[PDB]
């Protein structure tokens, strides 16, 4: 049904394309639309993917497309353009293209979600005949059985307790095995427990080397998801804790909301990926704490906030402009889904007035999450000559003013751990609290 | 048809099983035959695969099978036994098992071919009810299109001549690319040509390190098939010369036959494998000198010779015993195929009388190809006080006698390059020449 590329409707259509990564959906398909005389934009969340498409197209097909990223925009004048969603947003959206392919349209990072809503809101007005929502992983996808992987639940019987169940020593003594834990911390403690017990064991996370994992010999690697992005092949078995760390918003009311990195049950995509490290060129084993529960393509409300934040920080969009684009995304069927907290987030940002410009550009440059919310809290701090909620790296634009800031932090919301006393008097704190309780979904 | 495991016939059946590597054919299938009360032997060409199955079975299913290789035989007493074909032959064949699974039955190395003929000849007499010829690559398989790989023939247009066609510089300037050449020699010359031209290029073959290939950055790797067995992932494109080196027999009549490593067009398996280095997690390009021509599962007559040789050297089989087993293999449909040179090879070896025992064990130990033919030539040399055909490593059991060997080599056949004068007088030379011309297929 959605596995063939849509023929161009001679007016306006939104269409889905479910096809594997590499299969032609982002290359051969735009090539065929271009040979019929169309101009085609193809959007993707990744700078590397985007650059990779221009290499393929010119070398396979002698087609030199325009390649547009945050760094540079390469204009050849040909009919196909590749861009990241972020560069697309930075360029004003549709502002040119007959057909727009939104690639990896299952992505739930904020640039993808804002970028996609923008296409959906603007595509027809801008002269487009076709928007394609393309993906290899449609929303509601679950982990399906693999022919080469045998799946065996852990029980309570075992000498090594692990996320509420147990690993018998015998199933990891001998051969090469990968245990997934959620944090650098568990990795280290489990790695150390196992080593006490006589096992060749080694931790791996963000910021250690790939060479810390022996090519050969019995090993138990206790790792985070950093592994899949840093390292190549192997494994007789995977032991999956079945949880990850994700950005979540909590309407904690202490005074307002909390945005932090918390432990959530994994979704199908993380389950599929962690399992997929065994079964390569021979049979594999996958062991797990709990059966697959979350389908792919649900995202957190704090990603809606992040969209509003980036709209203000990067793209000179008022919160109301951000809502039209997000509304178009939430109103389009077959896309990732989320609680409808558009009115609420819009209203919060609408009263985040008179941010310090130099603070915001410092935060933007340093690359911290939520550049607008961090610089706004900082602004508020420097205007009350108060310290930031902690001296986390986040707050470094206040470090030069550190000797002159005294007293309780005027807390607007929580972006991490609290390390100073707080006052809840601030007019903006009050404003955000009233945004919460003026919204039936958020109260 | 051949994708489901055969139910046990209550008398005797030979059956085929076509199923992917890892899918259960060598593990789950024997497990299910064992739960019904059968004793199951599972044979494979690889020590590592064989050991890998015992790890899987005990860890996935709490089944500790017997694991038998050249090194050691592990006896647990359970109903499933894994063995290499070679260990099976060393143990006397069927000499116990209800069901015998011949795994990787498409293999065309001599141990697999002799091992398989032995099962086929002996299985019924020995009480077996079932022989399964199992494989992921049936004979006559061709290279089929891959959804993620775009295939583009080279033409004559290009600045870099390559196996009778050309590579334009533009298709390898920028990005990461793998060129296959047939010999360490071409690798080095092409690598050096490309470097002169401004390209980051690096050779790779048997005996250089994996680290000689940069993880990141534009590179052109000019390699042999050593690459697939030494190194892990990548590549925007593969450029395949479409030829490999294989052991071939030539009835050269100078005086008798030649067995040497020569350049042949590649078969589907080598084509599939070399192509398969691109298209991983994104789209790939494969370029080639000539369209796929050889289907898998044809092997050379010199593999029949090697079987006879190993029978004499390792397994105390007379040539006539070797023929009954090879005959059973050639008479069984759906197996690799070869010219029927059984009578001829049998007759050659039957007159290879009174080999020196110490020479043969030296050759066997040193691991040279054709241990019987090398030690027989050597024997013949030491009895004529003549030098070996060259001082290649092959002939090292004659090195201690080197000051006393003089005159022309009495050539029985050719196993490499000739580096001394030769006499064709030797009675055994005459005998082998008459084996050739007494056989209608070989004349
Ligand atoms: C650096 C970040 S983090 C983040 C998180 C959420 C959202 Cl919605 C945007 C963002 C951005 C903004 N952002 C993301 C991309 C994507 C890419 O790498 O090509 C990107 C590309 C270009 C720009 C960009 C470039 C210039 N010259 C000026 C301005 N104001 C923005 C901003 C971009
Ligand atoms: C070392 C070689 S190269 C070659 C080539 C062709 C053929 Cl038909 C056999 C052979 C052999 C013999 N060969 C191959 C294997 C397989 C494995 O590694 O388990 C193997 C295993 C065991 C034996 C083996 C073991 C003992 N103790 C005595 C004797 N006479 C043979 C010989 C073996
Ligand atoms: Cl605002
Ligand atoms: Cl003999
Ligand atoms: Mg593609
Ligand atoms: Mg250790
Ligand atoms: Mg298997
Ligand atoms: Mg170089």
UniProtKB/Swiss-Prot annotation, chains A, B:
- Topology relative to the membrane: Peripheral membrane protein
Where is region (RNA-binding) located? 273-284
Q: Where is the Helicase ATP-binding domain?
A: 6-156
Which residues take part in binding ATP? 19-26
Which reaction is the catalytic activity of this chain? Hydrolysis of four peptide bonds in the viral precursor polyprotein, commonly with Asp or Glu in the P6 position, Cys or Thr in P1 and Ser or Ala in P1'; a ribonucleoside 5'-triphosphate + H2O = a ribonucleoside 5'-diphosphate + phosphate + H(+); ATP + H2O = ADP + phosphate + H(+)
- Binding residue positions for Mg(2+) 1: 26, 104
Q: Which cell locations does it reside in?
A: Host endoplasmic reticulum membrane
Q: Which cofactor does it need?
A: Zn(2+); Mg(2+)
Q: Motif DECH box in this chain: where? A: 103-106
How is the cofactor bound, in the record's words? Binds 1 zinc ion which has a structural role. The magnesium ion is essential for the helicase activity.
| Comment field on protein domains | The N-terminal one-third of serine protease/helicase NS3 contains the protease activity. This region contains a zinc atom that does not belong to the active site, but may play a structural rather than a catalytic role. This region is essential for the activity of protease NS2, maybe by contributing to the folding of the latter. The NTPase/helicase activity is located in the twothirds C-terminus of NS3, this domain contains the NTPase and RNA-binding regions.
* Subunit note: Interacts with protease NS2. Interacts with non-structural protein 4A; this interaction stabilizes the folding of NS3 serine protease. NS3-NS4A interaction is essential for NS3 activation and allows membrane anchorage of the latter. NS3/NS4A complex also prevents phosphorylation of host IRF3, thus preventing the establishment of dsRNA induced antiviral state. Interacts with host MAVS; this interaction leads to the cleavage and inhibition of host MAVS. Interacts with host TICAM1; this interaction leads to the cleavage and inhibition of host TICAM1.
Could you tell me what this protein does? Answer: Displays three enzymatic activities: serine protease with a chymotrypsin-like fold, NTPase and RNA helicase. NS3 serine protease, in association with NS4A, is responsible for the cleavages of NS3-NS4A, NS4A-NS4B, NS4B-NS5A and NS5A-NS5B. The NS3/NS4A complex prevents phosphorylation of host IRF3, thus preventing the establishment of dsRNA induced antiviral state. The NS3/NS4A complex induces host amino acid transporter component SLC3A2, thus contributing to HCV propagation.
What is the protein name given in its UniProt record?
Serine protease/helicase NS3
* Gene source species: Hepatitis C virus genotype 1b (isolate BK) (HCV)
Q: What is the lineage of its organism?
A: Viruses, Riboviria, Orthornavirae, Kitrinoviricota, Flasuviricetes
